[PDB]
UniProtKB/Swiss-Prot annotation:
It comes from Severe acute respiratory syndrome coronavirus 2. It is a multi-pass membrane protein. This is Papain-like protease nsp3. Changing residue 31 to A: In strain: Mu/B.1.621. It is found in: Host endoplasmic reticulum membrane. The chain holds residues 1025 to 1191 of 7096 of the full protein. Inhibited in vitro by GRL-0617. Responsible for the cleavages located at the N-terminus of the replicase polyprotein. Participates together with nsp4 in the assembly of virally-induced cytoplasmic double-membrane vesicles necessary for viral replication. Antagonizes innate immune induction of type I interferon by blocking the phosphorylation, dimerization and subsequent nuclear translocation of host IRF3. Also prevents host NF-kappa-B signaling. In addition, PL-PRO possesses a deubiquitinating/deISGylating activity and processes both 'Lys-48'- and 'Lys-63'-linked polyubiquitin chains from cellular substrates.
Length: 167
């Protein structure tokens, strides 16, 4: 039993809700919140911009030190950093950005990172400003993630389409 509330159950392990991941994380304080990261961990907009703003830029400061030491992530890759005031940990995951021409097949590799964590709060990878079809992203999530994932969808209209169209 966990403290996530108001989710619709899609499969044994995947759940979904129309919610603001920033507000969800502050309420639940999950063990792991997933960020929709880029390889440079530059959290300028989208989910990453919102999560970083909620940390008062501490996420960006930590991320800049990470990159200075380790260099950029891979598309499809991830790193574990602090969750600051939002969660114990933040799993920064790089889904392909279609608006950069990045291969959408890497979306499965991106979701595989979730399997290293028993329970996660997450957005749909490569959705929003990353340009992928959220219906495809949800399908890949369900077919790739085996651990317990609580998916937060900010937009109410989009959530209804994902649910009504879920096979
Ligand atoms: C119009 C529109 C907006 C957003 C999305 C999803 C992306 C992630 O898939 N953004 C987010 N998802 C969850 N919480 C969030 N908080 C801040 C940003 C954000 C899709 C579409 C079509
Ligand atoms: Cl977004």
């Amino acid at each position: 039993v966990n403290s996530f509330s108001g989710y619709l159950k899609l499969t044994d392990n995947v759940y979904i809700k129309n919610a603001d991941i920033v507000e969800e994380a502050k309420k639940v304080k999950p063990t792991v919140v997933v960020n929709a990261a880029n390889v440079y961990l530059k959290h300028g907009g989208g989910v990453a911009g919102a999560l970083n703003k909620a940390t008062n830029n501490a996420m960006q400061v930590e991320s800049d030190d990470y990159i200075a030491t380790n260099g950029p992530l891979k598309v499809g890759g991830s790193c574990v950093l602090s969750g600051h005031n939002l969660a114990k940990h933040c799993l920064h995951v790089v889904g392909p950005n279609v608006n950069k021409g990045e291969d959408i097949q890497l979306l499965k590799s991106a979701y595989e990172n979730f399997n290293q964590h028993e329970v996660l709060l997450a957005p749909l990878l490569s959705a929003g400003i990353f340009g992928a079809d959220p219906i495809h992203s949800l399908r890949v999530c369900v077919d790739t993630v085996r651990t317990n994932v609580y998916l937060a969808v900010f937009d109410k209209n989009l959530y209804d389409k994902l649910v009504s169209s879920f096979l």
